[PDB]
Amino acid sequence: KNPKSDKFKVKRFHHIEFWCGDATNVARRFSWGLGMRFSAKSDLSTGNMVHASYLLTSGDLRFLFTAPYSPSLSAGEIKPTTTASIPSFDHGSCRSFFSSHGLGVRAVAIEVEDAESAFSISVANGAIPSSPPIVLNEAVTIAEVKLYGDVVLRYVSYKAEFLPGFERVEDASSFPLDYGIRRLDHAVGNVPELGPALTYVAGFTGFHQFAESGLNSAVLASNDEMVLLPINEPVHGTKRKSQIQTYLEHNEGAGLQHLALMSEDIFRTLREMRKRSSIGGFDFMPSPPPTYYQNLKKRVGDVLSDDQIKECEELGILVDRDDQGTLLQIFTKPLGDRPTIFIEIIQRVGCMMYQSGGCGGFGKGNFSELFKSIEEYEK
Amino acid sequence: KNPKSDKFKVKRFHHIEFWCGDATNVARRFSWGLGMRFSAKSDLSTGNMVHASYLLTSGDLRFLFTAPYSPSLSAGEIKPTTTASIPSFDHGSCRSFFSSHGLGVRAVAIEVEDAESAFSISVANGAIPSSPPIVLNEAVTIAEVKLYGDVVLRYVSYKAEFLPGFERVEDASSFPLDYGIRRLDHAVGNVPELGPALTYVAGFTGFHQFAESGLNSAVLASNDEMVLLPINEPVHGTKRKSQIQTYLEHNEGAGLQHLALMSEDIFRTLREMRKRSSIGGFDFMPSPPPTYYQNLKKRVGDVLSDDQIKECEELGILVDRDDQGTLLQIFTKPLGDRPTIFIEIIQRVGCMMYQSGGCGGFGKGNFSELFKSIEEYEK
Numbered sequence: 001k002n003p004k005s006d007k008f009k010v011k012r013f014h015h016i017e018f019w020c021g022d023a024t025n026v027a028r029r030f031s032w033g034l035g036m037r038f039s040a041k042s043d044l045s046t047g048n049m050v051h052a053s054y055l056l057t058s059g060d061l062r063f064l065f066t067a068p069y070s071p072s073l074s075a076g077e078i079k080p081t082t083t084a085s086i087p088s089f090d091h092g093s094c095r096s097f098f099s100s101h102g103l104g105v106r107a108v109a110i111e112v113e114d115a116e117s118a119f120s121i122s123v124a125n126g127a128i129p130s131s132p133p134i135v136l137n138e139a140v141t142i143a144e145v146k147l148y149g150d151v152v153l154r155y156v157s158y159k160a161e162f163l164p165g166f167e168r169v170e171d172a173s174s175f176p177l178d179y180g181i182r183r184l185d186h187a188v189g190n191v192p193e194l195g196p197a198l199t200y201v202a203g204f205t206g207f208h209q210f211a212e213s214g215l216n217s218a219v220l221a222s223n224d225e226m227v228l229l230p231i232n233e234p235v236h237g238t239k240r241k242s243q244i245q246t247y248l249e250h251n252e253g254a255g256l257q258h259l260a261l262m263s264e265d266i267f268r269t270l271r272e273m274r275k276r277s278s279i280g281g282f283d284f285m286p287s288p289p290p291t292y293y294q295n296l297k298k299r300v301g302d303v304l305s306d307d308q309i310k311e312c313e314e315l316g317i318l319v320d321r322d323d324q325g326t327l328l329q330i331f332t333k334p335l336g337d338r339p340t341i342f343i344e345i346i347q348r349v350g351c352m353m354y355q356s357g358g359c360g361g362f363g364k365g366n367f368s369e370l371f372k373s374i375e376e377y378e379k
Numbered sequence: 380k381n382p383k384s385d386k387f388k389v390k391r392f393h394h395i396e397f398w399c400g401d402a403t404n405v406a407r408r409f410s411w412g413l414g415m416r417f418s419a420k421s422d423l424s425t426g427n428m429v430h431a432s433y434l435l436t437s438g439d440l441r442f443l444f445t446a447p448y449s450p451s452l453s454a455g456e457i458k459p460t461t462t463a464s465i466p467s468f469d470h471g472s473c474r475s476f477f478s479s480h481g482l483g484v485r486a487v488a489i490e491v492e493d494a495e496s497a498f499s500i501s502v503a504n505g506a507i508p509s510s511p512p513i514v515l516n517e518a519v520t521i522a523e524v525k526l527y528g529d530v531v532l533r534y535v536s537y538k539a540e541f542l543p544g545f546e547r548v549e550d551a552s553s554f555p556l557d558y559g560i561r562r563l564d565h566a567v568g569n570v571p572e573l574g575p576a577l578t579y580v581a582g583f584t585g586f587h588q589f590a591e592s593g594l595n596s597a598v599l600a601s602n603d604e605m606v607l608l609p610i611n612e613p614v615h616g617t618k619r620k621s622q623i624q625t626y627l628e629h630n631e632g633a634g635l636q637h638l639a640l641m642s643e644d645i646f647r648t649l650r651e652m653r654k655r656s657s658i659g660g661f662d663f664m665p666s667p668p669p670t671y672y673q674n675l676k677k678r679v680g681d682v683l684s685d686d687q688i689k690e691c692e693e694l695g696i697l698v699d700r701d702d703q704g705t706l707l708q709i710f711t712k713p714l715g716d717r718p719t720i721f722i723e724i725i726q727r728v729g730c731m732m733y734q735s736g737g738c739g740g741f742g743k744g745n746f747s748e749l750f751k752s753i754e755e756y757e758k
């Protein structure tokens with residue numbers, strides 16, 4: 001059931017912004033690890049005396065990495081005379097965020113029809129304002145409201161190239177890496193209490209609800225279910241400590257838990273990412289046991305060949321299924337020092353009309369099944 | 380002239396420690412960019428609730444990358460009960476350093492015969508104490524005094540594996556990268572005033588002095604001239620602004636300007652590093668013009684073949700010469716967001732007895748010659 005209750009017109013995920021201590025090193029690591037190209041910059045070389053921002057792209061996926069310069073470089077500026085390309089940026093906020101949470105996502109940005117309208121309607125419906133709408137070079141409008149913790153939901157709307165004041169990266173500095181990643185599928189938050197978090201976000205967006213170990217979760221979705229925002233809370237008092245609780249402890253509270261990146265070919269993406277794990281890229285979760293794949297035949301043997309199923313076995317891919325589609329997924333180890341944010345690589349099969357959003361669900365069946373397999377691998 | 384006036388027994392450079400916001404991403408970037416292997420760790424997985432520290436090695440070169448965790452993880456600890464493996468570490472100092480300076484070197488560590496003696500003698504001769512000697516697992520002693528800015532000179536001495544509490548990295552996670560880098564040749568500081576900086580450091584170490592555009596410099600050297608510590612000050616009032624002054628402005632004062640890394644084969648090192656520049660590694664300075672290499676024949680045509688000289692031309696290597704040896708060198712672009720720290724790759728030829736330290740000098744002749752070539756390339 002989809003009541004299509006969005007209080008304003010939402011299009012697609014637009015970008016994800018990481019707040020960093022040093023944007024250059026994080027951006028270069030992520031570029032090599034994920035196969036994303038350096039596409040745009042805003043920094044000292046573009047006249048920005050406030051922050052260094054580097055944009056990586058793979059298909060429609062946009063990762064932005066931002067770090068503050070010394071405040072002394074811009075001490076004479078005021079907001080009317082700022083050289084920042086992202087006017088919501090604040091040195092103090094950025095340093096406070098990074099010292100509190102470590103490397104992580106500051107902004108989940110969605111493209112809307114009218115960012116000023118989205119901001120006004122959101123705050124009229126309970127959103128906590130974070131940065132008011134500002135029109136950039138009469139071309140782009142950006143506004144921000146609080147999402148959870150110190151993460152903001154950023155609205156961006158275009159009258160008619162990332163943002164004004166960004167420059168395209170020199171082609172010599174822009175190597176055309178591509179491991180198959182194409183778009184952001186969903187972005188997941190961890191909170192202490194799911195109920196109040198859901199009521200708040202659904203309250204100001206009109207997003208609707210989309211349809212034992214560790215967590216309770218629920219998913220908020222835009223009208224066409226292309227913007228997907230799951231939220232988790234911990235379940236306390238279990239034998240094994242909730243990884244949601246561990247997240248909240250090491251992150252100093254609520255924040256973004258994972259980004260799920262859709263691949264057009266998850267087998268190629270994982271081959272390429274795993275090649276680079278020990279040479280600067282990303283590590284993956286420990287693989288499921290053979291019993292997990294010895295049980296895939298009964299569960300998805302009509303969607304994947306046995307050659308493809310053991311090709312999932314090589315790469316350690318998990319598979320889950322809903323009533324409408326099938327889901328291939330795998331999780332990285334945490335992206336930085338703290339056991340907080342990680343990445344999920346995903347590919348969805350089914351639900352063709354284009355593919356409808358959330359085809360196959362989010363893999364919650366893989367909790368029971370992966371442990372069931374581990375225990376029956378003890379055998 | 381070498382008076383051999385060291386006030387305590389100094390052996391070799393031991394390690395360089397970077398203070399980071401996220402040690403994982405900087406370490407992974409540096410590993411791929413420089414061809415250094417992950418060799419040791421101290422972090423949550425080793426029981427360290429205070430800081431994440433990752434050690435990279437190439438030959439005798441040791442780069443350590445350290446970042447703080449949330450203070451809440453260790454709020455119950457006191458110094459007697461600390462889980463930190465580097466007891467001089469302080470959350471507040473580390474965050475203050477990184478917010479002030481950005482990514483950069485906190486510690487230049489040298490191995491000595493007796494770190495407690497070196498500390499006591501140093502402070503008796505004017506060194507500003509930073510961290511008192513502490514014996515680690517009855518095996519290693521570490522002490523720190525101020526060097527310049529917020530950089531410390533760290534003394535480490537061993538009774539008889541990096542530091543206690545560090546663990547060897549799993550071989551699966553330890554890919555054997557090697558681009559030919561073998562040891563730290565020198566470590567260079569930028570200060571506002573050279574005179575007082577030299578008097579201070581030479582005062583407490585007994586290091587001796589080793590023997591127009593932008594700077595004045597001088598080099599302090601240990602008895603066998605294997606520990607080399609050049610220091611630069613800006614020269615003001617020139618047409619082109621001093622890069623030393625630019626450093627001091629963007630760094631918020633004095634600090635480490637560059638690390639010079641000796642290669643056993645600078646041609647292989649540069650081939651490998653340049654292959655990776657646009658795929659997560661390091662960028663290099665713009666190459667000298669053909670006139671620079673069209674003038675190398677007259678200057679070093681008796682040390683390098685014409686095939687090797689144009690092989691310097693391919694890689695953009697600079698060459699300089701003293702009265703005793705020859706020096707091949709090249710400089711990276713800054714290692715992070717700010718125009719502050721960079722790396723030099725070096726190889727020295729001559730002065731065989733082993734090779735004596737500083738063979739060929741430090742390339743100061745390449746200032747005049749590189750511009751002379753650029754202007755006569757205008758031709």
Ligand SMILES: Cc1c(C(=O)C2=C(O)CCCC2=O)ccc2nc(C)n(-c3ccccc3)c(=O)c12
Binds near residue numbers: 217331362
């Ligand atoms: C992270 C995740 C998801 C997931 O994306 C997710 C949810 O957890 C809540 C709904 C929204 C959403 O996107 C689904 C299934 C998973 N299954 C397992 C076995 N693990 C896992 C747990 C320990 C160790 C290795 C993997 C996961 O992390 C895992």
Ligand SMILES: Cc1c(C(=O)C2=C(O)CCCC2=O)ccc2nc(C)n(-c3ccccc3)c(=O)c12
Binds near residue numbers: 637744
């Ligand atoms: C950095 C450096 C050194 C050097 O290592 C160094 C000194 O500067 C002082 C003595 C101790 C020491 O180790 C030597 C020669 C150099 N020559 C040039 C042309 N440039 C340079 C300047 C602009 C743009 C591209 C290169 C340098 O940076 C440069």
Ligand SMILES: [Co+2]
Binds near residue numbers: 362
């Ligand atoms: Co997910």
Ligand SMILES: [Co+2]
Binds near residue numbers: 639
């Ligand atoms: Co040098």
